[PDB]
Design a binder for this molecule. Structure first.
Ligand SMILES: [Cl-]
Ligand SMILES: [Cl-]
Lengths: 144, 144
């Protein structure tokens, strides 16, 4: 039972996969078994996430004994939104109550625009550099 | 049972109160009974929200038969953050999993910075104008 908006293991492990493929560009196909072993994840579960990524053109498969997956594009052009919205269902930032009026909805509109823009403008390259101070002195919570 | 991050009735009704006080600047003290009747809310519940607002300097009370509350500042300077963080507990945008690495945390950092900035830079005046297109063709969900 986790806190904050619903971004599940599908999006998160999707990110793990595409980031590892982004790190290893130029090393040939990378197997899901190797990513699974490296990150202590279920290979069988990753095999279920790789399909939507492949079908959306984010990764490509190479069959055979030396096969696996490669990133299918520039990490400087592929976004966090590309990956997350491929693997997650619709993610609700906030729900408006029935009695709410326009003034309150404007706040939700702005918050939604803001987060959506982060997804749409942050690239795999941005993430691999990870140069913004998280400000988490400890723990795992991102408080607004 | 609502979707999206945990902003409860405390923050939301806090906003309803301060927005109504912002609309009625210059009309003298406004009673909580009148706001409650107007918005079909529990007066007794609002009385519980008004204390933290008063103690934080956001509203002022006037006692007696013609008393009530007034906004204690400029709606162009009081922010959505002022109100929401006074009335809500810490709001978690996203929780990071134990295995996550810096690249994933950077995404959460950016999303957190973005939403926090909306809270800190959107004023009661901004909300009362409500000039941003919500993009909700229908329903109540703000999808990212
Ligand atoms: Cl999950
Ligand atoms: Cl509630």
């Amino acid at each position: 039972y986790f806190q904050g908006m619903k971004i599940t293991t599908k999006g998160r492990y999707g990110l793990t996969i595409t980031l590892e493929l982004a790190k290893r560009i130029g090393d040939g196909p990378i197997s899901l078994r190797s990513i699974a072993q490296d990150k202590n994840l279920s290979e069988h579960y990753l095999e279920q996430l790789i399909g939507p990524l492949r079908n959306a053109g984010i990764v490509k498969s190479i069959r055979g004994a030396h096969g696996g997956y490669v990133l299918n594009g520039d990490p400087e052009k592929i976004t966090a939104g590309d990956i997350i919205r491929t693997l997650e269902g619709p993610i609700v930032l906030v729900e408006s109550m029935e009695d709410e009026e326009a003034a309150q909805r404007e706040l939700w509109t702005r918050m939604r625009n803001a987060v959506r823009d982060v997804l749409d403008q942050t690239t795999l390259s941005d993430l691999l550099k990870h140069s913004t101070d998280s400000e988490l002195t400890d723990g795992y919570m991102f408080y607004i």
